[model samples]
Target: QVVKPTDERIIDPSTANTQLTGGVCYNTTSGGNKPLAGSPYGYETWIDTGGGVCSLCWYGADQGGGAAFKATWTNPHDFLGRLGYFWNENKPYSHYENIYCGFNYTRSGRKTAGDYSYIGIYGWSRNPSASNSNERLIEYYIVEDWFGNQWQADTSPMGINTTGGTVMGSFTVDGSSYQIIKNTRVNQPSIEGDKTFVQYFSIRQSPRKSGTISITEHFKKWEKLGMKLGDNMYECKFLIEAGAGEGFFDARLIQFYRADNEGNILQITPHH
Candidate 1:
């Protein structure tokens, strides 16, 4: 069901903070050598282009953690490939001060099949140290775009089949309506090993290829609906995930920054 995998490697945010001017320029044909560490953006990025045979993920330049990456795969009976954040922030959403992201991408893979794919901001939030044996974690998404077959149904975006979860509610943000949805995953490998946890989604009624996601609003809305997001916010990063099939996925990160709640778009204070 594409739950957060336990093998996820979270790069040191401190390193990314200092490498804003560095950008990331890398490529990989192996998943085992993922969570690649380098300069170009200094952010730790990962890729799995396939090696038994091969698939390819090219992580391009950057502006802070904001960078460009793409993937190409021919076929995989059952597969999963994703690129973005496995951040270790682990603080309440309030700690970000504010969460806002700007992105633009081009995906040609969806033209073949969109059913088991997702293009958006996907990440996790947790309640305890993820290394804890009993940590509580949540996988969440802010879906902004999609390919063929569309990621919606009955005029609403569908998440990994929910364990009987329905639209908790909806709200408008960043100029579009987003439906708040929640699902449950039991005994799934996550940030805290194999465990049961809740997953959240904020699906945009209409999709866009480029725009600003006022992420803080989604968190607040979920909290308002009583869907607790835990105290430790893991990572909220731009991602394109594929459950199966083969195709090309490309995305360019414009900026992933914290800003003033008033739309002032504040600059990120140097992270220590």
Candidate 2:
């Protein structure tokens, strides 16, 4: 039976002395400060439960990365279970920071009406001024659930909508094809002022919920089609962002790693 989220207030990962079991960190967001032992990856990991917006989740364990990292989780409830890396860099970087991983899971429930499950990286636009909310930079994703029409239907200013953007074209990566869409927002409250953000995504054209994918290869394909590779990447997250339902996702031997220019694989976490 699948466990549901507790209705308690969100717990801090750094101070959740009792809620934290196994090797999980409960408080680190995509930008929080916390480091586990023997971790070489320049990022932090964390878990969340359903709060005001139905974002419940549980992650059994997570290890930081180096050239590579891996993790596993068994969801007890229907929350947004995630295992991720939050890099410390606050400025833009290039696509050479590609990542690769595997996801294997068994589902026990159905997803909510406005939720999604995906694996990808995203960041914020440059903070030109000292104050104000930064516009969303770029959101690239590899969709894991077929019920991702909510985000696709999301019209922006605030929603993930792209009704006003241009479709750049398509490209293939890791044996799959992804359609690239470019959306530009105006008068957004960015320190840099009116911002233009790009979004790239690949839907469930083929259904195989368990397999390996190279995120770097996606970047390479997008760059080939005129997508700029420079952006400030804040987080590389594998998450189940729930909107209004109940379900679970389990991943085993989920490897996270980076490649050098010469393609040498550097292992970040030890294989269990």
Candidate 3:
């Protein structure tokens, strides 16, 4: 939803650039959005399978605390630049099996025609408590804003086809109305190779530019709506994913970490 643009966390464009003190700016990769081999933050992940002539650049990042970065991409089939608490490998997505995650980011969204893109919280969740192997892995998203075509006008988020699934329900959080969607992928690629998995989405009805996403709130809400999450927590990160067009995303201020229901910083692990 649209909030006042006066959040102190927002680093004005003039004050924030690719040349932050002590922070490094990655050179532009014109071929594809490959992974940064030695990413210091350990949370930066880049994926470009579109195979199109796309260029991706990540620069002006925060060093000591939180996360700050800039990105630009063009004509890609799917270019995903995710930054956060990566699980599965430090990384159940490992430290705390039940992590209550959240991300505070500043306003940022720009794109050209046909740019099917989104900026929000993305992550994975698993229900290891299922009986008779009824456990499941869930890919979840809390879309804050987006660009390019009117993808929201459709039934599902861009790049994903959930028409085969049913409308799970809806809820209000972070001052926005979200329509929850459920979809299943048969023998699809996941953190665990080729396997069947379900995807959950909370697409905001009114896209906004900046705010604090109480990531755990979405997870909890999903459970209340019948989308239960097990104790196996993967990762909750700020993500900018795009498909088919040129786009730009920037962050004046960024912070990601685990927290409790009371909003206290989680001390389960020092990983974040």
Query: Highest TM-score, which number?
Result: 1
Candidate order by lDDT, decreasing, is 1, 3, 2
Tens-digit lDDT string for candidate 1 (26-58)? 343232224544421222223334422224343
How many clashing residue pairs, candidate 1? 7
lDDT of each: 0.56, 0.41, 0.55
lDDT of 3 by residue, 1-272 (tens): 32222323333423333332333444333232233334423344454543454332333233412455555566666666665555554223324422432233332334441445667888787776656242387777888767636444422344344224657888887677788877777788776678887777887777765555656567767888777666676666667777656556665545544533343444322154
Error of 1 at 194 (Å): 1.5
Global fold similarity of model 1 (TM-score): 0.70
Question: What's the distance in Å from true for residue 56, model 3?
Answer: 5.9
- For candidate 2, what is the lDDT? 0.41
Q: Which one wins on lDDT?
A: 1
Task: Name the runs in model 2 displaced over 4 angstroms.
Answer: 1-82, 88-98, 108-110, 113-136, 146-166, 185-196
lDDT for 132 (candidate 1):
40
* Superposed Cα RMSD, model 3: 6.8
